Design a protein around this ligand. Structure first.
Ligand SMILES: Nc1ncnc2c1ncn2[C@@H]1O[C@H](COP(=O)(O)OP(=O)(O)O)[C@@H](O)[C@H]1O
Ligand SMILES: Nc1ncnc2c1ncn2[C@@H]1O[C@H](COP(=O)(O)OP(=O)(O)O)[C@@H](O)[C@H]1O
Ligand code: SF4
Ligand SMILES: [Mg+2]
Ligand SMILES: [Mg+2]
Lengths: 280, 280
């Protein structure tokens, strides 16, 4: 069952709109937890972009599970080819997916999670396990962590943008749908700032209406791009930089989080009027 | 699907979420129906269900899935699913299932089949646009290419890496289904974000992709001002430079003959291209 895999670990899944900063937040948060707090972790990329583990692997792209299955076949698959070790011993896995227009994009997630369970790719002694999931659509393999209770705690990365909040509200609808069946809950909304006026204020009212909390406000900092150029995470590049400490704060907040709640999704009218009220 | 609206230019607009597909599709259709007096129709294939709002003057449209769910296949009528808006532009919203329930693109198949059965695609149509979600190329979202529903595809994109990544993925889907359905890429439409050298990056991207940058839509506040008045930019101010830009684009789409099978870029090629200009 999905509850027996890494039982001593805090299973978390990060959802959000495309390009909102899920990979950046998930990788830097995991890097902070493994570096400052010396915790054993693992990242399972459930985004077909397949770059959710690049900064942990120091710029080296990882072969996806679908790519390895396609070339080596089910017989020639080894845990060493699909799971790599990066910064501070963080294990990395990329689910991947089918070619655009071929089948269901989420199918790669289900195959990778089942293969990881089969090969014992999730260490029992793990302290945290993160899943970078595509949140533009809540269906198939993308909605599997919410439906099958793979990760009990969900966090959505969002900005003041209408699309980002719309996606977050849709993910909350999926959480509410299988909240009693799977026991999945929303830990909070993580705001990846875009440097707009009154972004935090809009996000805090959005969380109030959604029945959750704005767990953390990540500022927009060019250190992310400077670190990405040296093929490293911000934590690995400059652990003393204020940005690295922001990910450290978020990391501890996620670990010590207890306010997990079933969401109260907003209506399409409530969301629009909330966006119009602030008018960023 | 070649028998539905045979005298019409069947086009499908793809692109990343929040890139400006609904804004471009609606204003382009409004320009074609207002300046050139062409009979047109918009079939929203985005689960957001707001691709036909400005044409309907801010009035929300009941989606096909909503009507089908609460009234059954018998209680369905064209009057309830197809509405008339600015300059007699017909409007339909496919809709979709609740987040986490089934396949998000399912609403597209049900709506296109239902229109095909009720004869909701006027034969005397001059143009037929499909606002499709491009974050993931699968299911009902990849159907228009698959069944050759719309033979000409245009992708709305900006200088952002995620917007270009999505456009490249849509091009991959076009290439796979180019010989089977005869679908083709008409060009890339750039929805400007007011960044330095955005056009130059987009033009090199089109060169590498084997297509052309059909048009450059500037970022104008008149869009939000017309949105506030529950109207399209064409209906709000047909003499505004922006309203004209959509008129130029509309004619370019109608008189377009340079349809090409795309040469998708590799992940390395796209990253090096983004780094060459370093817009962001
Ligand atoms: N806190 C931040 N400060 C500055 N840039 C950021 C921040 N978070 C994300 N970014 C940038 O945003 C872009 C998208 O980030 P990413 O993590 O890949 O989003 P996603 O995984 O949802 O697609 C990247 O270029 C990244 O450098
Ligand atoms: N040419 C433009 N100039 C200014 N704003 C624009 C333009 N095109 C789109 N927008 C804005 O961008 C946002 C997203 O537009 P939208 O059409 O809904 O994208 P999508 O259909 O891909 O979800 C809207 O708030 C809209 O006002
Ligand atoms: S369930 Fe989702 S990912 Fe799968 S084919 Fe449908 S829209 Fe695509
Ligand atoms: Mg990502
Ligand atoms: Mg839309």
């Amino acid at each position: 069952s999905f509850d027996e895999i890494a039982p001593n670990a805090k299973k978390v899944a990060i959802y959000g709109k495309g390009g909102i900063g899920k990979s950046t937040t998930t990788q830097n948060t995991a890097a902070a937890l493994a570096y400052y707090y010396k915790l054993k972790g693992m990242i399972h990329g459930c985004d077909p972009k397949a770059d959710s583990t690049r900064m942990i692997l120091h710029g080296k792209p990882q072969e996806t599970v679908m790519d390895v299955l396609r070339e080596e076949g089910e017989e020639g698959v080894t845990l060493e080819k699909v799971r790599k070790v990066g910064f501070c011993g963080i294990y990395c896995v990329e689910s991947g997916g089918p070619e655009p227009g071929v089948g269901c994009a989420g199918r790669g997630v289900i195959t990778a999670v089942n293969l990881m369970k089969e090969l014992g790719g999730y260490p029992d002694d793990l302290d945290f396990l993160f899943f970078d999931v595509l949140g533009d659509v809540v269906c198939g393999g993308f909605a599997m962590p919410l439906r099958d209770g793979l990760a009990k705690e969900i966090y959505i990365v969002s900005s003041g943008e209408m699309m980002a909040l719309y996606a977050a509200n849709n993910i909350a609808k999926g959480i509410l749908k299988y909240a009693e069946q799977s026991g999945v809950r929303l830990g909070g909304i993580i705001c990846n700032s875009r440097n707009v006026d009154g972004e935090r204020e809009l996000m805090e009212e959005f969380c109030d209406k959604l029945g959750t909390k704005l767990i953390h406000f990540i500022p927009r900092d060019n250190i992310v791009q400077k670190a990405e150029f040296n093929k490293m995470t911000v934590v690995e590049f400059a652990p003393d930089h204020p940005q690295a400490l922001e990910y450290k704060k978020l990391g501890k907040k996620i670990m010590d989080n207890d306010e997990l709640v079933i969401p109260t999704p907003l209506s399409m009218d409530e969301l629009e009027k909330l966006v119009e009220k602030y008018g960023l």
